[PDB]
Design a protein around this ligand. Structure first.
Ligand SMILES: C/C=C\C/C=C\C/C=C/C/C=C/CCCC(=O)O[C@H](COC(=O)CCCCCCCCCCCCC)COP(=O)(O)O[C@H]1[C@H](O)[C@@H](O)[C@H](OP(=O)(O)O)[C@@H](O)[C@H]1O
Ligand SMILES: CC(C)CCC[C@@H](C)[C@H]1CC[C@H]2[C@@H]3CC=C4C[C@@H](OC(=O)CCC(=O)O)CC[C@]4(C)[C@H]3CC[C@]12C
Ligand SMILES: CC(C)CCC[C@@H](C)[C@H]1CC[C@H]2[C@@H]3CC=C4C[C@@H](OC(=O)CCC(=O)O)CC[C@]4(C)[C@H]3CC[C@]12C
Ligand SMILES: COc1ccc2[nH]cc(CCN3CCCC3)c2c1F
Lengths: 286, 57, 336, 235
């Protein structure tokens, strides 16, 4: 039974690594994909490559073995890397949303002020937030329960740390990115709404098609984000507070963890493997 | 549009009095030039990388 | 008037004389010649720094210094050996589609949609390139320019004319009229005694720089001609057109010698050049490929794939060591 | 390699590259517009209306391409009037691929007038032909058109005196400014075949100093926003 789990997790890890590396290489070698938006998408791909290469192998090993056989120090390292690289990925999603919001609503800023320095400042900010979430548990704010069982690598269950990390990693990023994409939806819908009868019919059909397309895009973005992370963070915020009478099934917990893990796989699929410029660059490469 | 007609017809009548050699002679001359300078053409015959300025000093 | 009655008679007489002189095709003469074989060229230097479509380039006589012009309004003098930018001249007009580098290397020419040919003095006392002269008088866009000396420059423009300018005084020493379409190409003879100009009327005319008269004409193409280049001998020249075909014409035979066309190419030629011996004819196309043809056998010897958008300019060094192709993707490539 | 000359050449090339990068990023802030139209089609009128209080913010006169740099609401516009280019447009129109928009100026009052080349050729039909040619080039597939229907007062006087049926035999309607102007606008907007990918912004040029430049700015910002939305897949 463990062979099936091992091969499925290995397939997932290999697909994530291949996709992220392909996106990073396509951005690096191609001169066409050398703007701020693609800089942010490439940084997101690099962050997901760090997740797929650093935490996804040890997490898969922990899943298959059903125990941690790497030591306390390596357990702390794995937890720190997991939190840092998964918060950084979420905050790259919220940086991409912010850049899109600034491009849609501020054309003057997009023309006169948008520079790759802005992309660098956003990426550094996301990584700084990841560090600020991932580092405190090592340097205090930690309960001995993590070291209570040597055969487990559970994250710190402190209530203060639970609230702090869950809010600064998902919930604040969820609210902010929801607000930004709602504003983008309003702007896009306003722009879309903005023989003669045949021309009017064609214009109405084109407007309806554009509205359907924008709904589809803002669905495949937020829905994917929510389906992948909200199940994991609801549990991560509720369980530490509900110590008893709220037993977590192991299969459901594993499914909920790996849905969050698969966001590193699905991020290049949405932000890279859909837009036409990346497809043309990949066709040129292959 | 008659003034330019005189110039055009003069140009044609001057262009028709030039001496022409047979196409065989021109083909032979081009072939002879290509064969005489074939050794001196780096693109035609690949040059060793030792004396190739754009590959190795 | 009645002059059109004898104009067609003169055309028929010229065609009959050319047919009489045409006894053996150049392909028949070179049938027994063994093929050159596959020509494999690898990009040796990728000159980067242009930020817009590159429209023209010209090699230096030293065969290492290069000039390139692009739509971002910069004329870059490169050292092709070390990929070092020697000069970057900010042009007054960003719309430039031609550039020439003087044989002595002291001056460089540029021109384009603005009808002025700008001559920049490269080496001066302060070491800063400065606009030496601005040549006005053309009423159409300047499509090509070539230096005869440090003081004479021939320029072809889109008002269906060419002009030989004395840079010292800045006035047109001679004007060459006779084309009915925009002249797009301009090649100088090795001895700088004659030059061929190809225009949009699908005809190429041979002009004498001294007398300023159309020596002879060649009408073989179906579409407008974009590129032209003398054979190294100076007795023949190749023309590339939007008919997706090149044509080698002879000056002494006064007719078309050979045609270079393929079924898989339907895009016109933007640039034409010959190798040092003249055996290889390198033609850049709109499909971002440079076909190297056996100029004596009309066989595609090779393909210089590697450019992205469209090969707009192409040039072979005087020593023949390398060929540089500049394309719309803002990159120069040395192929060697 | 370690020689002084090689190091000096390398640092000179690096300095040149830095200057090139700075100039390129400075030019990236410029909004390039391609101004087109017939000879006496109000092109000069539009140009002089724009360069009233915002402009340019021993050379030789060119009569080639005219470059007009102006600034509106912190946006810098480069506008290129190719009017002295009496040649084949097909040989240089690809130089302008990538412009934000094509400002096409057409005079409404030339529908009655005829070209000097031949009597049986309306100037309005020539303007429509050139609009059709430039709106459907392989280079301008995604480039939007800002249409400027100039000389509304002269057109109004002409339609009050002369009928519009001479320019449009198929036309049938009351001779008034509103209906005739709408008919001309729809006739020019019907020449657009790339309806999905490009939009035509029309404006009847008025005498107010800033309304035309405001319309150009609005159209350009709309084009930029819609291009960004397309980049995100929301358009
Ligand atoms: C019943 C009513 C309603 C419902 C019915 C119908 C409507 C909806 C149905 C459900 C939709 C499901 C997903 C649809 C995906 C889809 O349509 O994909 C299209 C084709 O993709 C390929 O060809 C690319 C194919 C390869 C993709 C990756 C494959 C590799 C995966 C592993 C990766 C790692 C290894 C490589 C492309 O996407 P698109 O045509 O849908 O439209 C847009 C897309 O939505 C925007 O996101 C994108 O913007 P971006 O955010 O910057 O990316 C836009 O540019 C554009 O692509
Ligand atoms: C990769 C894993 C995490 C799964 C993620 C799935 C979601 C991204 C899916 C589930 C339901 C999908 C939506 C279901 C239906 C539609 C309607 C569809 O357009 C219509 O048919 C119009 C409907 C209307 O106008 O009412 C456009 C796609 C969209 C928004 C879909 C977008 C993508 C969604 C949100
Ligand atoms: C939206 C697209 C990208 C698909 C994403 C699917 C993944 C989230 C799936 C693929 C394989 C799944 C795994 C396959 C098998 C197992 C073993 C399973 O084993 C248990 O611990 C419970 C059973 C037991 O005790 O043996 C737990 C779930 C898990 C890790 C699964 C977690 C969810 C995974 C990674
Ligand atoms: C307190 O729980 C928290 C709080 C913030 C967090 N940021 C990133 C993570 C890790 C996300 N990985 C996905 C599946 C397993 C864990 C995290 C967390 F687990």
């Amino acid at each position: 039974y463990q062979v099936i789990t091992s091969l499925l997790l290995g397939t997932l890890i290999f697909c994530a690594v291949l996709g992220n590396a392909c996106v990073v290489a396509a951005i690096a070698l191609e001169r066409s994909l050398q703007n701020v938006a693609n800089y942010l998408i490439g940084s997101l791909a690099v962050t997901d490559l760090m997740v797929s290469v650093l935490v996804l192998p040890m997490a898969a090993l922990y899943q298959v073995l059903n125990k941690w056989t790497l030591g306390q120090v390596t357990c702390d390292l794995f937890i720190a890397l997991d939190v840092l690289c998964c918060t950084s990925s979420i905050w790259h999603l919220c940086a991409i949303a912010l850049d899109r919001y600034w491009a849609i609503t501020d054309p003057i800023d997009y023309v006169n002020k948008r520079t790759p320095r802005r992309a660098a400042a956003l990426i550094s900010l996301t990584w700084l937030i990841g560090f600020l979430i991932s580092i405190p548990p090592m340097l205090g704010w930690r309960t001995p329960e993590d070291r209570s069982d040597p055969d487990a690598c559970t994250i710190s269950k402190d209530h203060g740390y639970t609230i702090y990390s869950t809010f600064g990693a998902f919930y604040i990023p969820l609210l902010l990115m929801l607000v930004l994409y709602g504003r983008i939806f309003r702007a896009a819908r306003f722009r879309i709404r903005k023989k003669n009868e045949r021309n009017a019919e064609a214009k109405r059909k084109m407007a309806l098609a554009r509205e359907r397309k924008t709904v589809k895009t803002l669905g495949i973005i937020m829905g994917t984000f929510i389906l992948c992370w909200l199940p994991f963070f609801i549990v991560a915020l509720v369980l530490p507070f509900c110590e008893s009478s709220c037993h977590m099934p192991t299969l459901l917990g594993a499914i909920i963890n790996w849905l969050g893990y698969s966001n590193s796989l699905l991020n290049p699929v949405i932000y890279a493997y859909f837009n036409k410029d990346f497809q043309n660059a990949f066709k040129k490469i292959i | 549009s008659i003034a330019q007609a005189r110039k055009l017809v003069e140009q044609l009548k001057m262009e028709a009095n030039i001496d022409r050699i047979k196409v065989s002679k021109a083909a032979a001359d081009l072939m002879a030039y290509c064969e005489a300078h074939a050794k001196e053409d780096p693109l035609l015959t690949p040059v060793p990388a030792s004396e190739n300025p754009f590959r190795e000093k | 008037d009645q002059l059109r009655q004898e104009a067609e008679q003169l055309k028929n007489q010229i065609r009959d004389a050319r047919k009489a002189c045409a006894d053996a095709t150049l392909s028949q003469i070179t049938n027994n010649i063994d093929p050159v074989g596959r020509i494999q060229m690898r990009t040796r230097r990728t000159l980067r720094g242009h930020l817009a479509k590159i429209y023209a380039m010209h090699w230096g006589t030293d065969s290492r210094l290069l000039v390139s012009a692009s739509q971002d309004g910069k004329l870059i003098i490169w050292d092709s050996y070390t990929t070092n930018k020697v000069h970057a001249i900010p042009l007054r007009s960003s719309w430039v589609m031609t550039c020439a580098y003087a044989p002595s290397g002291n001056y460089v020419a540029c021109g384009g949609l603005d009808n002025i040919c700008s001559i920049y003095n490269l080496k001066t006392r302060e070491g800063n390139v400065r606009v030496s002269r601005e040549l006005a008088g053309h009423t159409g866009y300047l499509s090509c320019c070539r230096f005869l000396d440090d003081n004479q420059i021939v320029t072809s423009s889109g008002d269906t004319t060419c002009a030989l300018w004395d840079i010292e005084t800045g006035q047109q020493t001679t004007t060459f009229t006779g084309h009915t379409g925009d002249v797009m190409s301009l090649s100088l003879a090795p001895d700088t005694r004659l030059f061929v100009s190809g225009a949009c009327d699908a005809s190429a005319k041979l002009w004498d720089v001294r007398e300023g008269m159309c020596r002879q004409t060649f009408t073989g193409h179906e579409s407008d001609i974009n590129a032209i280049c003398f054979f190294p001998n100076g007795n023949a020249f190749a023309t590339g057109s939007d008919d997706a075909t090149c044509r080698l014409f002879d000056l002494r035979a006064d007719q078309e010698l050979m045609t270079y066309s393929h079924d898989n190419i339907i895009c016109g030629i933007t640039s034409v050049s010959f190798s040092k011996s003249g055996r290889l004819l390198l033609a850049g196309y709109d499909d971002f490929n440079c076909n190297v043809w056996d100029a004596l056998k009309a066989d595609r010897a090779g393909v210089l794939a590697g450019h992205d958008n469209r090969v707009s300019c192409l040039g072979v060094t005087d020593d023949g060591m390398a060929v540089a192709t500049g394309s719309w993707d803002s990159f120069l490539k040395i192929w060697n | 390699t370690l020689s002084a000359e090689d190091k000096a050449a390398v640092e000179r090339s690096k300095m040149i590259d830095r200057n090139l990068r700075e100039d390129g990023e400075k030019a990236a802030r410029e909004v390039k517009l391609l101004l087109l139209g017939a000879g006496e089609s109000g092109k000069s009128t539009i140009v002089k209306q724009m360069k009233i209080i915002h402009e340019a913010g021993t050379r030789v006169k060119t009569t080639g391409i005219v470059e007009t740099h102006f600034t509106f609401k912190d946006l810098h516009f480069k506008m290129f009037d190719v009017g002295g280019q009496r040649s084949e447009r097909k040989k240089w129109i690809h130089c302008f691929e990538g412009v934000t928009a094509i400002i096409f100026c057409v005079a409404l009052s030339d529908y009655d007038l005829v070209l000097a080349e031949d009597e049986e050729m309306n100037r309005m039909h020539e303007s429509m032909k050139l609009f059709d040619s430039i709106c459907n080039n392989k280079w301008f597939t995604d480039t939007s058109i800002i249409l400027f229907l100039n000389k509304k007062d002269l057109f109004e006087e002409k339609i009050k005196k002369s009928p519009l049926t001479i320019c449009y035999p198929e036309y049938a309607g009351s001779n008034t400014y509103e209906e005739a102007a709408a008919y001309i606008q729809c006739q020019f907007e019907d020449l657009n075949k790339r309806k999905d990918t490009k939009e035509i912004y029309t404006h009847f040029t008025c005498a107010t100093d800033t309304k035309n430049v405001q319309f150009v700015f609005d159209a350009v910002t709309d084009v930029i926003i819609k291009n960004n939305l397309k980049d995100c897949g929301l358009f």
